[PDB]
Amino acid sequence: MKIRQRQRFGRLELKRISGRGFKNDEEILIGNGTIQKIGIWDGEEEFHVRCGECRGILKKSQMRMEKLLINSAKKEDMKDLIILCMVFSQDTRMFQGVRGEINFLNRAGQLLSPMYQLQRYFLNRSNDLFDQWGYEESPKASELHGINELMNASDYTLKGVVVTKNVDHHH
Ligand SMILES: CN1CN([C@@H]2O[C@H](COP(=O)(O)OP(=O)(O)OP(=O)(O)O)[C@@H](O)[C@H]2O)c2nc(N)[nH]c(=O)c21
């Protein structure tokens, strides 16, 4: 239907544009050697995504971020959107990136649930994530360019992530 409330994953705002995922509770052995109970989504899905000023298209499958296209925006929003999408995608690389205990409390003194532990952890320790994520030679394409961990156009890109330029197509 035309009017749809957006879904939210902390700071990440999302709207699904294709696919049909199904959620199954699974036990996941993550990178710090602990087992986490997580509702894992299965199926190829694409989302419209946004964090602050940065907007993009996220394509995922089960525990895999396939492709992330985003616009150029303020670097903190670009970086946060990428991290939130890596976490949202439940990518195995993301799970494997965790070190030490994820036992963060909220302001009501309760433990965050596992997905929110992960969002909180990687937002504030992104080098853990990006190291595990992998880098590849940037795509050489006309309207797309890769980005590095500093959110700059580079010869090498975070794997699966692509940025568009702000171009005056209509003059
Ligand atoms: C990883 N997610 C998370 N998610 C949805 O994104 C929102 C934020 O996830 P969440 O806060 O972990 O949801 P949760 O607390 O598990 O509640 P729910 O029972 O709705 O899943 C929720 O609306 C959740 O349903 C998703 N929706 C789809 N279609 N595919 C997905 O892979 C995912």
Swiss-Prot record:
Regions annotated as coiled coil: none
Entire protein: shown range: 320 to 485 of 770
Localisation per UniProt entry: Virion; Host nucleus
Name of the featured protein: Polymerase basic protein 2
Domain of life: Viruses
Protein family: Belongs to the influenza viruses PB2 family.
Gene name tied to this protein: PB2
Subunit description: Influenza RNA polymerase is composed of three subunits: PB1, PB2 and PA. Interacts (via N-terminus) with PB1 (via C-terminus). Interacts with nucleoprotein NP (via N-terminus). Interacts with host ANP32A (via C-terminus) and ANP32B; these interactions promote viral RNA synthesis.
Role: Plays an essential role in transcription initiation and cap-stealing mechanism, in which cellular capped pre-mRNAs are used to generate primers for viral transcription. Recognizes and binds a wide range of cap structures of target pre-RNAs which are subsequently cleaved after 10-13 nucleotides by the viral protein PA. Plays a role in the initiation of the viral genome replication and modulates the activity of the ribonucleoprotein (RNP) complex.
